[PDB]
Design a protein around this motif. Sequence first.
Motif, PDB file in Angstrom:
ATOM      1  N   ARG A   1       0.978  -1.642   0.244  1.00  0.00           N
ATOM      2  CA  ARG A   1      -0.072  -0.234   0.595  1.00  0.00           C
ATOM      3  C   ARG A   1       0.921   1.911   0.249  1.00  0.00           C
ATOM      4  NH1 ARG A   1      -5.537  -1.357   1.417  1.00  0.00           N
ATOM      5  NH2 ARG A   1      -5.402  -3.159   3.276  1.00  0.00           N
ATOM      6  N   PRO A   2       0.494   2.208  -0.729  1.00  0.00           N
ATOM      7  CA  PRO A   2       1.085   3.695  -0.660  1.00  0.00           C
ATOM      8  C   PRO A   2       0.985   3.941   1.340  1.00  0.00           C
ATOM      9  CG  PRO A   2      -0.899   3.892  -1.451  1.00  0.00           C
ATOM     10  CD  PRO A   2      -1.316   2.859  -1.344  1.00  0.00           C
ATOM     11  N   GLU A   3      -0.516   4.066   1.232  1.00  0.00           N
ATOM     12  CA  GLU A   3      -0.921   4.312   3.414  1.00  0.00           C
ATOM     13  C   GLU A   3       0.105   3.686   4.115  1.00  0.00           C
ATOM     14  OE1 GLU A   3      -5.371   3.567   3.212  1.00  0.00           O
ATOM     15  OE2 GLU A   3      -5.882   5.538   2.673  1.00  0.00           O
ATOM     16  N   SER A   4       0.585   2.222   3.938  1.00  0.00           N
ATOM     17  CA  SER A   4       1.261   1.769   4.499  1.00  0.00           C
ATOM     18  C   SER A   4       2.376   2.385   5.508  1.00  0.00           C
ATOM     19  CB  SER A   4       1.599   0.465   4.469  1.00  0.00           C
ATOM     20  OG  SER A   4       0.162  -0.742   4.650  1.00  0.00           O
ATOM     21  N   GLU A   5       2.753   3.172   4.582  1.00  0.00           N
ATOM     22  CA  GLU A   5       4.240   3.555   3.972  1.00  0.00           C
ATOM     23  C   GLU A   5       4.132   5.374   4.781  1.00  0.00           C
ATOM     24  OE1 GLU A   5       7.222   1.873   3.739  1.00  0.00           O
ATOM     25  OE2 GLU A   5       8.242   4.064   4.249  1.00  0.00           O
ATOM     26  N   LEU A   6       3.029   5.919   4.670  1.00  0.00           N
ATOM     27  CA  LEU A   6       2.704   6.999   5.030  1.00  0.00           C
ATOM     28  C   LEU A   6       2.723   7.002   7.021  1.00  0.00           C
ATOM     29  CD1 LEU A   6       0.164   8.939   2.521  1.00  0.00           C
ATOM     30  CD2 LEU A   6       2.276   9.956   2.914  1.00  0.00           C
ATOM     31  N   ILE A   7       1.798   6.034   6.909  1.00  0.00           N
ATOM     32  CA  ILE A   7       1.586   5.788   8.500  1.00  0.00           C
ATOM     33  C   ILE A   7       2.695   5.311   8.789  1.00  0.00           C
ATOM     34  CG2 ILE A   7       1.125   4.116   9.754  1.00  0.00           C
ATOM     35  CD1 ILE A   7      -2.333   3.868   8.076  1.00  0.00           C
ATOM     36  N   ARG A   8       4.368   4.895   8.933  1.00  0.00           N
ATOM     37  CA  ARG A   8       5.313   4.448   8.822  1.00  0.00           C
ATOM     38  C   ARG A   8       5.721   5.380   9.044  1.00  0.00           C
ATOM     39  NH1 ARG A   8       4.761  -1.278   6.127  1.00  0.00           N
ATOM     40  NH2 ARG A   8       4.876  -0.537   4.657  1.00  0.00           N
ATOM     41  N   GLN A   9       6.007   6.548   8.116  1.00  0.00           N
ATOM     42  CA  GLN A   9       6.825   7.579   7.963  1.00  0.00           C
ATOM     43  C   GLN A   9       6.495   8.586   9.211  1.00  0.00           C
ATOM     44  OE1 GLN A   9       6.544   9.084   4.000  1.00  0.00           O
ATOM     45  NE2 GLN A   9       7.970   7.065   3.345  1.00  0.00           N
ATOM     46  N   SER A  10       4.942   8.966   9.813  1.00  0.00           N
ATOM     47  CA  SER A  10       4.023   9.795  10.247  1.00  0.00           C
ATOM     48  C   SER A  10       4.848   9.501  11.808  1.00  0.00           C
ATOM     49  CB  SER A  10       2.503  10.006  10.413  1.00  0.00           C
ATOM     50  OG  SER A  10       2.178   8.904   9.496  1.00  0.00           O
ATOM     51  N   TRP A  11       4.533   7.970  12.180  1.00  0.00           N
ATOM     52  CA  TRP A  11       4.361   7.651  13.214  1.00  0.00           C
ATOM     53  C   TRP A  11       6.067   8.008  13.935  1.00  0.00           C
ATOM     54  CZ3 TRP A  11       2.112   6.510  17.198  1.00  0.00           C
ATOM     55  CH2 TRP A  11       2.311   5.486  18.050  1.00  0.00           C
ATOM     56  N   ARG A  12       6.954   7.734  13.429  1.00  0.00           N
ATOM     57  CA  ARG A  12       8.906   7.778  13.695  1.00  0.00           C
ATOM     58  C   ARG A  12       9.031   8.467  14.037  1.00  0.00           C
ATOM     59  NH1 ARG A  12      12.778   5.079  11.910  1.00  0.00           N
ATOM     60  NH2 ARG A  12      11.702   3.244  10.686  1.00  0.00           N
ATOM     61  N   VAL A  13       8.435  10.164  13.646  1.00  0.00           N
ATOM     62  CA  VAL A  13       8.595  11.439  14.250  1.00  0.00           C
ATOM     63  C   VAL A  13       7.679  10.920  15.938  1.00  0.00           C
ATOM     64  CG1 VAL A  13       8.263  14.206  14.363  1.00  0.00           C
ATOM     65  CG2 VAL A  13       7.993  12.314  12.386  1.00  0.00           C
ATOM     66  N   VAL A  14       6.840  10.549  16.203  1.00  0.00           N
ATOM     67  CA  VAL A  14       5.955  10.290  17.321  1.00  0.00           C
ATOM     68  C   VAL A  14       6.692  10.110  18.440  1.00  0.00           C
ATOM     69  CG1 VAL A  14       3.600  10.055  18.043  1.00  0.00           C
ATOM     70  CG2 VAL A  14       4.245  12.141  16.488  1.00  0.00           C
ATOM     71  N   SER A  15       6.553   8.390  17.760  1.00  0.00           N
ATOM     72  CA  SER A  15       7.606   7.085  18.347  1.00  0.00           C
ATOM     73  C   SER A  15       8.393   7.857  19.029  1.00  0.00           C
ATOM     74  CB  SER A  15       7.098   5.988  17.421  1.00  0.00           C
ATOM     75  OG  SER A  15       8.241   6.253  16.168  1.00  0.00           O
ATOM     76  N   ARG A  16       9.390   8.504  18.991  1.00  0.00           N
ATOM     77  CA  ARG A  16      10.323   8.710  19.593  1.00  0.00           C
ATOM     78  C   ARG A  16      10.223   9.289  20.844  1.00  0.00           C
ATOM     79  NH1 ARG A  16      13.612   8.636  14.067  1.00  0.00           N
ATOM     80  NH2 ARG A  16      13.515  10.903  14.024  1.00  0.00           N
ATOM     81  N   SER A  17       9.177   9.781  21.172  1.00  0.00           N
ATOM     82  CA  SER A  17       9.037  10.416  22.530  1.00  0.00           C
ATOM     83  C   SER A  17       7.653  10.306  22.631  1.00  0.00           C
ATOM     84  CB  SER A  17       8.893  11.687  22.386  1.00  0.00           C
ATOM     85  OG  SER A  17       8.477  12.712  21.300  1.00  0.00           O
ATOM     86  N   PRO A  18       7.239   9.119  23.216  1.00  0.00           N
ATOM     87  CA  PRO A  18       5.843   8.745  22.713  1.00  0.00           C
ATOM     88  C   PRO A  18       4.733   9.126  23.793  1.00  0.00           C
ATOM     89  CG  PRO A  18       7.195   6.799  23.589  1.00  0.00           C
ATOM     90  CD  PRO A  18       7.814   7.502  23.343  1.00  0.00           C
ATOM     91  N   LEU A  19       5.053   9.409  25.175  1.00  0.00           N
ATOM     92  CA  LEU A  19       5.042   9.918  26.656  1.00  0.00           C
ATOM     93  C   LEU A  19       3.842  11.582  25.872  1.00  0.00           C
ATOM     94  CD1 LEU A  19       3.800   9.848  29.177  1.00  0.00           C
ATOM     95  CD2 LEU A  19       5.763  10.572  30.652  1.00  0.00           C
ATOM     96  N   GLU A  20       5.449  12.496  25.883  1.00  0.00           N
ATOM     97  CA  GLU A  20       5.208  13.996  25.207  1.00  0.00           C
ATOM     98  C   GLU A  20       3.944  13.495  24.370  1.00  0.00           C
ATOM     99  OE1 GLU A  20       8.547  16.058  23.709  1.00  0.00           O
ATOM    100  OE2 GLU A  20       9.477  14.489  25.483  1.00  0.00           O
ATOM    101  N   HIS A  21       4.025  12.775  23.440  1.00  0.00           N
ATOM    102  CA  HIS A  21       2.703  12.702  22.265  1.00  0.00           C
ATOM    103  C   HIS A  21       1.209  12.442  22.635  1.00  0.00           C
ATOM    104  CE1 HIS A  21       6.665  13.720  20.172  1.00  0.00           C
ATOM    105  NE2 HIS A  21       4.933  14.480  18.579  1.00  0.00           N
ATOM    106  N   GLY A  22       2.384  10.797  23.799  1.00  0.00           N
ATOM    107  CA  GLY A  22       0.367  10.765  24.404  1.00  0.00           C
ATOM    108  C   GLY A  22       0.265  11.388  25.144  1.00  0.00           C
ATOM    109  N   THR A  23       0.609  12.404  25.919  1.00  0.00           N
ATOM    110  CA  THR A  23      -0.102  13.366  26.804  1.00  0.00           C
ATOM    111  C   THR A  23      -0.771  14.494  25.402  1.00  0.00           C
ATOM    112  OG1 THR A  23       2.153  13.065  28.251  1.00  0.00           O
ATOM    113  CG2 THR A  23       0.701  15.471  28.340  1.00  0.00           C
ATOM    114  N   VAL A  24       0.177  14.925  25.108  1.00  0.00           N
ATOM    115  CA  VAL A  24      -1.460  15.023  23.975  1.00  0.00           C
ATOM    116  C   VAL A  24      -2.566  14.704  23.711  1.00  0.00           C
ATOM    117  CG1 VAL A  24      -1.186  16.934  21.346  1.00  0.00           C
ATOM    118  CG2 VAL A  24       0.960  16.851  23.054  1.00  0.00           C
ATOM    119  N   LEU A  25      -2.506  13.434  23.369  1.00  0.00           N
ATOM    120  CA  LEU A  25      -3.268  13.160  22.892  1.00  0.00           C
ATOM    121  C   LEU A  25      -4.537  12.897  24.321  1.00  0.00           C
ATOM    122  CD1 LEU A  25      -3.874   8.973  21.394  1.00  0.00           C
ATOM    123  CD2 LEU A  25      -5.463  10.457  22.723  1.00  0.00           C
TER     124      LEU A  25
END
Length: 148
Positions: A1-25
């Motif tokens: 899929r193209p969508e699989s790569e869009l997910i993987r790429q977008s997640w990378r930035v967020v996944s390195r500081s999951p608590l900071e980002h989850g705190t926003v969520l």
Amino acid sequence: RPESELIRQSWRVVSRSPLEHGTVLFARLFALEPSLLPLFQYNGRQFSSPEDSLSSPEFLDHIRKVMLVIDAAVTNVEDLSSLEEYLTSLGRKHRAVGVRLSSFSTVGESLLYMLEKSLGPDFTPATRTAWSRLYGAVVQAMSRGWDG
Ligand code: HEM
Ligand SMILES: [Kr]
Ligand SMILES: [Kr]
Ligand SMILES: [Kr]
Ligand SMILES: [Kr]
């Protein structure tokens, strides 16, 4: 899929500081649906205010647990059938803690908010659509835990 790569790429930035980002969520989630706050009962006590939740080690640990489940859906983006049983049981668990299946919609909006805010111009409408589909497939699996 193209969508699989869009997910993987977008997640990378967020996944390195999951608590900071989850705190926003979760900050967003409580701002949209304050009635979710009492469902986090640790040592039988209720958080009064959203800011209260952010000082709770258990609550923060739960943010990490959320970001880890999302990480597992990203890992398995090309076939979520392999997480289906885990997710159904996750749903039953949440049913038992008092979460209404309809609240997962607000969770989805909160996730999309957090992604939008972290990615800025890189959160293209294709990126939005991809995440909406992935989250929707997660919730579909979880909903089996409520029966229907
Ligand atoms: C309205 C949204 C939610 C509420 C009110 C909620 C509340 C809770 C509560 C009270 C627990 C039990 C205590 C704890 O382990 O901290 C729990 C466990 C958990 N939640 Fe959530 N939660 C929500 C959404 C989510 C979402 C969206 C995910 C994952 C994508 C998630 C993943 C987990 C996990 C992995 C556990 C550990 C469950 C176990 O014991 O195996 N939760 N949640
Ligand atoms: Kr929060
Ligand atoms: Kr989520
Ligand atoms: Kr979503
Ligand atoms: Kr997701």
